[PDB]
Every structure is written in C-alpha cells, then in structure tokens.
Design a protein around this ligand. Structure first.
Ligand SMILES: NC(=O)c1ccc[n+]([C@@H]2O[C@H](COP(=O)([O-])OP(=O)(O)OC[C@H]3O[C@@H](n4cnc5c(N)ncnc54)[C@H](OP(=O)(O)O)[C@@H]3O)[C@@H](O)[C@H]2O)c1
Ligand SMILES: NC(=O)c1ccc[n+]([C@@H]2O[C@H](COP(=O)([O-])OP(=O)(O)OC[C@H]3O[C@@H](n4cnc5c(N)ncnc54)[C@H](OP(=O)(O)O)[C@@H]3O)[C@@H](O)[C@H]2O)c1
Ligand SMILES: NC(=[NH2+])NCCC[C@@H](N)C(=O)O
Ligand SMILES: NC(=[NH2+])NCCC[C@@H](N)C(=O)O
Lengths: 307, 307
C-alpha cells in the first residue's frame, strides 16, 4: 500500500504525515508535476492525493496500478471523474472542511463591497475624516439574498443570513427541498435578489450559468458574490455590467484569469486570491477529512465517493 | 414658531423639508457656523437642530429665546447638556436611527481585519491568484466577542453575534442584566475576548476607558473594533500594541486625530471615516426621529430627552 500526495500541499503538518505513514508508504511531492511526472506518480501508487494537477482522460488512459484518488479540495472540476470511473479508479473529495470559512468569506466580501472598505480606508490614509456621501450604504438586514447552489456552503450562508434576518431564496438542480430557503428559478432569483452568491460546482452544465442575459436582470444596486469558479459567469458581460455601474459591485474570490484582466481596473469590485477557505479550522478539518477518506477506504467502506 | 437647522445637514430630503414647514418657519444653514454665528442662530430661533457644531457652556449662557435643542446625532458629547438644563433649554437626541447600520459595520470591520481584505485585494490587483498563507484566518463562529457597552447598538451587535453562533460577553455601567450577554468586568473582558467592540458614549467617565494596562491584557490574536469615539482609548498605547503586533489588528471608525497620526502607517488596521452609521435605512430613521422629537415638543411632552 503506497499513498502519494502528488503535488505541493498547502497544508500537511507533521502529525498528518506521521499518521498517514501508519497506513502505508506515504510519499509527498513539494512541486507542481509536469504531465509526465503526474502520470508517473499516479501510476506508482495505490492511493493518490491531488491538490493542483489536472488529470485528463488522455492521462488516465496511460495510468496503471492506481485504485483510489482523493482530491484535497471540495472541487473536483479539474479531474475527469467519468474517465476515472471508466478505468475503475474510485474518487473521493474532502466535502465539508471549508464550508464555515467560505460562508464567512461571503459576508466579508459583501460588507467590503457594501461599505466600500477599500475606498473608506484609503480616505482615512489621506487624513480625511467624517466623510459620509461616498459611503452611503445599504443595511443587509431584511434584504433578499439569492443562493445559486444550496448544498454544504449555500446552506451555511443561509444560516448566517436567516439570523441576520434576511430573506433567503435559492436554487439547486434536484429540486430537493432545503429547509429555510424559498426555492425559485434562476430568472426570478436574478430579478428579486439584492445579493446574489454562487455556491455551485463547475462542470459542463454550470459553465457560464450567469449569462449576459441573466446578468442584465440584476437590480440596479445588487451585489454579486462569487466564491466559486470564475468560469461560472460570462466574465466579459460581468465586466460591462460593473464598468457601466449597472449594479452596486461584486466580491470575487476567483477570476478566469488575472494578468491584464480588465476587472482588475474596476473600483466597484473587491477581489480575494482564492483565500475564502483558508481558516485555521478549515485546514485542520481538511486533514481530518483526508485521513477519514484513507481509513474508510482501507476499511472497505469508502466515504465521500464521487459518482 | 421658528425651527432652525443651524449647520449643514448630511441628509434633509424633500418630505422632511415639507413636513417641518407645516409646524412653522423652517430655516436651514448649508454651511458650518463659527461660535459667534452659532450663538446668533441659536438665539434667533425657538427650536434648533444641530449636527456638527460644539455648543459650550460659554455659548449657552449667551443664548436667548431658544427653548429646545435637537442633536441629529445619537452622541451628544459636543453639547453641554448640563448648562442647557441650567438655562432651561430642553434637549433631545436621535437615539436609535443608526443601530443596525453600526452593528453591521462592526462585522464589516471585523471581517476586513480577519480576512486582510486590503492586502488580499492588492494581491489580486498585482495579478496573483491562489495565495493562501498570508491570508490564514480564524473563523468567527464559536469565538468570544466582548461588548464594552450593551445598550441600543451593543445589543444589536450581540444579536448578530448570535447569528454567527458566537459567545457574547459584555459590560454596562448599571450592572442591570441583559439577556443573552454574559456580564463580566472589564479586566475579564479584555483577557477572555477574541474580539472586542466598543459601544459606549464618550463622557467624563468613559474617556480612555481602554488604558495601557487594559490593552496589555488582550489575547495575542485579538481584534479590537471601535465604532465609538477614538478618545475612549489610550490611542498612543493602541498604536504601540499594533506596531509591535501584540494583537491581530483593529478596525477603527474614528481616531482622535488623522493628520500625521502614526496609526495611518499600520498594516494591521482597517480605517473608516466615521461612515459606520450611513445607511439608507439609518438616515431615513434619523428623519423620523427628528420629526418625532419636534412634534413631541410641540405637544409639550418631549421625547428622547437627554438628562
Ligand atoms: N473559494 C473557496 O475557497 C472554496 C472552497 C470550497 C469550495 N468552493 C466551491 O464551492 C462549490 C460548492 O461547494 P459545496 O460544498 O456547497 O457543494 P455541494 O454541497 O455539492 O452543493 C452544490 C449545490 O449546487 C447545486 N447544483 C449542482 N449542479 C447544479 C446545476 N446544474 N444547477 C443548479 N444547481 C446545481 C446542488 O444541487 P443538488 O443538491 O440538487 O445537486 C447543490 O445545491 C464547490 O464546487 C467549490 O467549487 C470554494
Ligand atoms: N460610528 C457611528 O457612526 C456611530 C453612530 C451612532 C452612535 N455611535 C456611538 O455609539 C455610542 C453608543 O450608542 P448606543 O445607542 O448603544 O448608546 P446607549 O443605548 O446609551 O448604550 C450605552 C451603553 O454603554 C454603557 N455605559 C455607559 N457608561 C458606561 C461606563 N462608564 N462603563 C461601562 N459601560 C457604560 C451603558 O450602560 P448602562 O445601560 O448601564 O448605563 C449602555 O450599556 C454613542 O454614544 C455614539 O458615540 C457611533
Ligand atoms: N484545500 C486546499 N488545499 N485547497 C483549497 C481549494 C479551495 C476550493 N477550490 C475547494 O476546496 O474546492
Ligand atoms: N446622523 C448624522 N447626521 N451624523 C452621524 C453621527 C454619527 C454618530 N457620531 C452619532 O450619531 O452619534
């Protein structure tokens, strides 16, 4: 039994390295493998752990030995899970470690946009005080927040919202009834929400789910929050919406690209570099989930299986 | 009956101008009077409304005619209410208009400090993605927040802290019990709080309530929030705490002074220019309190009376 963390871990403390070596031969690579290194590392192990590296169907056809792949992430959009299924390789993610961290980040971003924290701080650094007109804001209490995706993270955001005394609406794919969330279609969500937050995986179905048309339905003072992939939005259309001040602002933890992206020029966005998840509590839970995946698989009762 | 708003109103919309003109002659000065002009304006009116101008005992003893002074603010630390009472001038404030806006600003500041929003946004503007280590944060869920002052605004903060499922401790002067808040003395509050937030008026008793000694008791990762007057804190001692990184950071909506204040040079503070209160909802409620004050005085049963 060989277990391999095939690319550079953000967090992998000594106690976890020691624990995983109790289960088998554990090897960790502190780099980003090229495609050939990735195939070789995947083919030299029985369980693999991945954080950064795309695993494509073309790669999986060249893989041998590997039986179990764990994404350290909740997302698995960079892994061809269907191709792994077709090659009898089981896949698990780490499904809940970050949900509180990300839900709190939604409110961090929402408040940073609403209160224009970037401009407000810069005003004070200029030595100006008691400046109100540029910072006229809306209270979030009693506003409508619309959650596109109401799973682990969406439901955590709803809990915080519902006790901020907000109206929570939302949508999912299965139409399973989620408690405390009035479920609507996406057109109504875009029309009625004061705040819109995305909590949905990226795949072929959800890419560019926020079309130019749907974005044009937003309220004139709406705030859009994205702690998910930038590819979920027509990003060029979002730029035009913000550039033309057709909504209040956006808080974005991901963009489809960064260098020379015109959104970087906007004074009504707040950007974070994918840091929504990274709390002390989340990264520790991430380790507990990784270890639970390994133990449960060795017990022949695997958990968090992606199917 | 003559009513005068003696200095520049931040907000005085059409419906308020029209309503106050029903009671008599309404004059508004869209400027900032000096002391002599303030005395003259106050002495040339029956009811006065004030927003910016200090009204000292020396001025009050020179005033005639005036019977009722309304501060548009909740604070009245710039008005000598004792001298007003001794000269048989009634005084009211506007006591609740901003409590939701300020309570939400506490969390806007808390999250801005905790998630290092200023630095995170700057990282993205430099074109960098997936930068985690500098932004390692604590979730605020299950943390202890200590509220110095648990009146109108403090209790609103306490309600939001329960929304995030935090432990709330606090103190007041009367030691009257407040439900949902575990009351402690200030030494215990400074020692046990992960987040400290001030919600206390500025007066002879509360100035520099946060001493150098009390500030030295703070937890190494504590976050201090001040939406009240900067003079509640030994500000030089606070600078020393932050400069030496003895706590995580501070979110400050006021400073004792701004020009060349060394706090402006700190990378672990988030500053807002007194903008905590300024929501659409708050300024509208401010007008309804102004009207209720005027009408109550006209009915010879004044409300919101100071002292
Ligand atoms: N920024 C960060 O640091 C960070 C950290 C972790 C995760 N994330 C992102 O957050 C995403 C969500 O995580 P989660 O744990 O909340 O996922 P989850 O529990 O799987 O929930 C996903 C939600 O999206 C819904 N959904 C899926 N496909 C849909 C479609 N085509 N149309 C409408 N709704 C659809 C699901 O509906 P059903 O229940 O009906 O299937 C469910 O309500 C992840 O995929 C990841 O990309 C970001
Ligand atoms: N940043 C902004 O834009 C903004 C906007 C509005 C207000 N404010 C500030 O917020 C302050 C508080 O407003 P509020 O409406 O919450 O006031 P409030 O309802 O009068 O509450 C004041 C609280 O402070 C307590 N307190 C008074 N003196 C004290 C002392 N010496 N030691 C300990 N506790 C003491 C009171 O306790 P007892 O009940 O036992 O007396 C009460 O719990 C205002 O004075 C104002 O300066 C700021
Ligand atoms: N956990 C970790 N080492 N990386 C964070 C990844 C965040 C988000 N994409 C996700 O979890 O899907
Ligand atoms: N409401 C108004 N025009 N000014 C806001 C003043 C905020 C705070 N000092 C207070 O109300 O005490």
């Amino acid at each position: 039994m060989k277990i391999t963390y095939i690319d550079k871990p953000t967090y992998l403390p000594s106690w976890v390295i020691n624990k995983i070596n109790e289960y088998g031969d554990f090897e960790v690579f502190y780099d980003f493998p090229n495609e050939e290194e990735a195939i070789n590392r995947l083919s030299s192990t029985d369980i693999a752990i991945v954080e950064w590296t795309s695993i494509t169907k073309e790669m999986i056809e060249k893989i041998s030995r590997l039986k179990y792949l764990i994404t350290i992430t909740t997302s698995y959009d960079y892994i061809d899970v269907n191709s792994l299924k077709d090659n009898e390789i089981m896949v698990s993610n780490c499904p809940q470690y970050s949900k509180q961290a990300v839900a709190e980040h939604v409110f961090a971003l929402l408040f940073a946009v609403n209160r224009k924290i970037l401009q407000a701080d810069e005003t004070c650094r200029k030595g100006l005080s008691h400046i109100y007109p540029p910072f006229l804001c809306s209270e979030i209490r009693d506003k409508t927040i619309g959650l596109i995706g109401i799973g682990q993270i969406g439901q955590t955001v709803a809990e915080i919202a519902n006790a901020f005394q907000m109206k929570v609406i939302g949508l999912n794919k299965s139409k399973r009834n989620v408690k405390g969330i009035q479920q609507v279609d996406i057109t109504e969500l875009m029309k009625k929400s004061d705040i819109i937050s995305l909590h949905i995986p990226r795949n072929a179905d959800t890419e560019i789910i926020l079309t130019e048309k749907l974005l044009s339905l937003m309220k004139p003072d709406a705030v859009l929050i994205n702690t998910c992939r930038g590819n979920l939005i027509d990003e060029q259309a979002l730029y035009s919406v913000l550039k033309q001040n057709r909504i209040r602002g956006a808080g974005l933890d991901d963009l489809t690209y960064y260098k020379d992206n015109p959104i970087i020029g906007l004074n009504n966005v707040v950007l974070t570099p994918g840091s929504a998840w990274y709390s002390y509590e989340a990264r520790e839970k991430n380790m507990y989930e990784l270890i639970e995946n390994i133990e449960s698989y060795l017990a022949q009762k695997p958990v968090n299986v992606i199917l």
